[model samples]
Target: TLVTGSEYETMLTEIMSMGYERERVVAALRASYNNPHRAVEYLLTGIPG
Candidate 1:
């Protein structure tokens, strides 16, 4: 369920509106789409992938 390209951009925009940091949100979003486990890692680091 990892979103890429335009799909990823759409999601990123929504999250950004929520006031989430771009990098952190991107990492989590990527993990959700590409690797759920890595999403957890992103949460831990508070960084984007």
Candidate 2:
């Protein structure tokens, strides 16, 4: 499912604040149903679990 506008903005801000590249953060958001915690987990680990 596509993320809501606010969700996207929130995810982008949170992920980027941690110093991750925008592209990578966006990709992570896409892969993790736009869930910030899941995206962070995916970025930190290899799995989106």
Candidate 3:
């Protein structure tokens, strides 16, 4: 396999480095269909789903 990841994983960890929680971050991403923009909203609004 090639040695690089893509947008979804990249953005998720970026926010985590900025102090967001990972459990719900992944949760938010799941529901948002891997859209980082939409996932951010769910996390900020505390839904994460």
Candidate 4:
């Protein structure tokens, strides 16, 4: 299934609001299948997909 535009924007916006850089957030989102929490976990843990 495809993620809707609004959901994608919402996830990105919420993550960016947490002070993460755009490039990193984008990469994390992609790697985590657009899950904000997992993306943040990856960012905080220095883990990558």
Name the candidate that leads on lDDT: 4
Query: Candidates sorted by TM-score, descending order?
Result: 4, 2, 3, 1
lDDT of 2 at 34: 75
Q: Which stretches of candidate 3 lie over 4 Å from their true place?
A: 1-6
Which lDDT tens digits does candidate 2 get at residues 1-49?
A: 7777987888798789999999999888888877778889898995533
TM-score of 2: 0.75
RMSD (Cα, Å) for all candidates, in order, is 4.9, 2.7, 4.4, 1.7
* Ranked by lDDT, top first: 4, 2, 3, 1
User: Distance from true position, residue 6, model 1, in Å?
Assistant: 1.2
lDDT-better candidate, 2 vs 3: 2
Q: Which pairs clash in the backbone of model 2?
A: none
Q: Please, what is the TM-score per model?
A: 0.53, 0.75, 0.67, 0.79
* Candidate-wise lDDT, in order: 0.64, 0.84, 0.74, 0.86
lDDT of 4 at 31: 85
Model 4 CA deviation exceeding 4 Å by range? none
Q: How would you encode candidate 3's per-residue C-alpha lDDT over 1-49 as one tens digit per residue?
A: 2324576678789768867888878888788777777888877776543
